[PDB]
UniProtKB/Swiss-Prot annotation:
EC number: 2.7.11.24
Taxonomic source organism: Homo sapiens
Mutagenesis / variant outcome for changing residue 308 to N: In NS13; results in increased MAPK signaling; increased translocation to the nucleus; reduced interaction with DUSP6; no effect on interaction with MAP2K1
Activity: how regulated: Phosphorylated by MAP2K1/MEK1 and MAP2K2/MEK2 on Thr-175 and Tyr-177 in response to external stimuli like insulin or NGF. Both phosphorylations are required for activity. This phosphorylation causes dramatic conformational changes, which enable full activation and interaction of MAPK1/ERK2 with its substrates. Phosphorylation on Ser-19 by SGK1 results in its activation by enhancing its interaction with MAP2K1/MEK1 and MAP2K2/MEK2. Dephosphorylated and inactivated by DUSP1, DUSP3, DUSP6 and DUSP9. Inactivated by pyrimidylpyrrole inhibitors.
Protein name (Swiss-Prot/TrEMBL): Mitogen-activated protein kinase 1
Function: Serine/threonine kinase which acts as an essential component of the MAP kinase signal transduction pathway. MAPK1/ERK2 and MAPK3/ERK1 are the 2 MAPKs which play an important role in the MAPK/ERK cascade. They participate also in a signaling cascade initiated by activated KIT and KITLG/SCF. Depending on the cellular context, the MAPK/ERK cascade mediates diverse biological functions such as cell growth, adhesion, survival and differentiation through the regulation of transcription, translation, cytoskeletal rearrangements.
Major enzyme class: transferase
Length: 345
C-alpha cells in the first residue's frame, strides 16, 4: 500500500515508483510508473463519499472524460477502486502524464508570439469539441491547461462542468459562485448562473491576456472587487449593454458608478501582435450575447496558420440533459460512481 507522504495510495501492482505532484479541492495527484504500458502516468486520488457535492463532481468528471475523445482534452486511461461498494472509500483516476501546466510555465517563462498562437489554437480546438457536446467547462484557467515538452496542450478537470442550460441562466445581483475569481465573466456577478457557452469564452480571453504579459488581467482580491477590475479596463458599459441587465439591483449598481474610459489593449500590451489584441477584444466583450463564439474565434485572422475546420472535430454524442444530482444523496451517487467505473475492473 504505497504511501505518498502521509496518505494511502492503493494503486499497485500495476502502478509503482510513486512521486507527489499536487493537491487540492479535486483530491490529490501523483506520478507513477505503469508496468503494463511501460511509461509514467498521473494518478488522481478522490475521496468523495463523505460529501454529496464531492460525489457530484466525481461523477460529473468520470462521466464526461469517459465519453470525450480528443487530442486537446485529457483522457482517462484507468480507474482504480475497491471490488465492492462496501469496501470503496476512494477512487483513483489514471491519466497520461503531462510535464507541466500553463500556470507554472507563465510564472517563469516569457512566451513568443508563435507559442501564444499555438497554445490559444489548442485551447479553442479543445473548447470547440467540449461546446459541441453541449458541455461548459466553467473552470478554465492556466492550472487546468496541461503541457508536454513539444508544446502539446490538454484541458483537464471537468469537476465543475455542466450541461449548457441557456433558458435557465438568469439570476439576481451578487449571487454566489464556485468557479475561479480572476477568470469569471462580469455577468456572473450581475445576473447569470454561468449556464451559457459565453462564460468559457471569457475565461479563454483572460488566459490569452495572461499569456501576453505573464500577469492576470483582472486580479480581483475578493468577489465584488472582480467587477471593479473588469470595469476598470473595459470602461462603463454602453446603454445597449445595460438593456440586457433587467434585474434592478445590478442595473442600478452599474448606473451609480462614475463614467470610466476603456483602457486601450495596445497600451496594456505594447509588444502584442495587433491580430492577437483584436481577438482579445472580441473574447473580453462585456455583453455575453455580443461575445465571440468558439468557431468564430478559431476562424479569426490571428489563428489563420492553424485554422483547419476539417481537423477541428466535434463530439459524436452531445450530453442531452444535466444530470439531476442536486438532491441525490452521497449513497445513490456512490452506486452511480461504482457502475460508471465497473469497466476498469
Ligand atoms: O484534474 C486535475 N485537477 C487539477 C490538477 N490536475 C493535474 C492533472 C494532471 C494530469 C496529468 N499530468 C499532470 N501533470 C502535472 C501537471 C502539473 O505539473 C506537474 C505535472 N497533471 C490533472 C488534474
Amino acid at each position: 500500500p504505497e504511501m505518498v507522504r502521509g496518505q494511502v495510495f492503493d494503486v499497485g501492482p500495476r502502478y509503482t515508483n510513486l512521486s507527489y505532484i499536487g493537491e487540492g479541492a479535486y483530491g490529490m495527484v501523483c506520478s507513477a510508473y505503469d508496468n503494463l504500458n511501460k511509461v509514467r502516468v498521473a494518478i488522481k486520488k478522490i475521496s468523495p463519499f463523505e460529501h454529496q457535492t464531492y460525489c457530484q463532481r466525481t461523477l460529473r468528471e468520470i462521466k464526461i472524460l469517459l465519453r470525450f475523445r480528443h487530442e486537446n482534452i485529457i483522457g482517462i486511461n484507468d480507474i482504480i477502486r475497491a471490488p465492492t461498494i462496501e469496501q470503496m472509500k476512494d477512487v483513483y483516476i489514471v491519466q497520461d502524464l503531462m510535464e507541466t501546466d500553463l500556470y507554472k510555465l507563465l510564472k517563469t517563462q516569457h512566451l513568443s508570439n508563435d507559442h501564444i498562437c499555438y497554445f490559444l489554437y489548442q485551447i479553442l480546438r479543445g473548447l470547440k469539441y467540449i461546446h459541441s457536446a453541449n458541455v461548459l467547462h466553467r473552470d478554465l484557467k492556466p492550472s487546468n491547461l496541461l503541457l508536454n515538452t513539444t508544446c502539446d496542450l490538454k484541458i483537464c478537470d471537468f469537476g465543475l462542468a455542466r450541461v449548457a442550460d441557456p433558458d435557465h441562466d438568469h439570476t439576481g445581483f451578487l449571487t454566489e459562485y464556485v468557479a475561479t475569481r480572476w477568470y469569471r465573466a462580469p455577468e456572473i456577478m450581475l445576473n447569470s448562473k454561468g449556464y451559457t457557452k459565453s462564460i468559457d469564452i471569457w475565461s479563454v480571453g483572460c488566459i490569452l491576456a495572461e499569456m501576453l504579459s505573464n500577469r492576470p488581467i483582472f486580479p480581483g482580491k475578493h468577489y465584488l472587487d472582480q467587477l471593479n477590475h473588469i470595469l476598470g479596463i473595459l470602461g462603463s458599459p454602453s446603454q445597449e449593454d445595460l438593456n440586457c441587465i433587467i434585474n434592478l439591483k445590478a442595473r442600478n449598481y452599474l448606473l451609480s458608478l462614475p463614467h470610466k474610459n476603456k483602457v486601450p489593449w495596445n497600451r496594456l500590451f505594447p509588444n502584442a501582435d495587433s491580430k492577437a489584441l483584436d481577438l482579445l477584444d472580441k473574447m473580453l466583450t462585456f455583453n455575453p450575447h455580443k461575445r465571440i463564439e468558439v468557431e468564430q474565434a478559431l476562424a479569426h485572422p490571428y489563428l489563420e496558420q492553424y485554422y483547419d475546420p476539417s481537423d477541428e472535430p466535434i463530439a459524436e454524442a452531445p450530453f442531452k440533459f444535466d444530470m439531476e444530482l442536486d438532491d441525490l444523496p452521497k449513497e445513490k451517487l456512490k452506486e452511480l460512481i461504482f457502475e460508471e467505473t465497473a469497466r476498469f475492473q
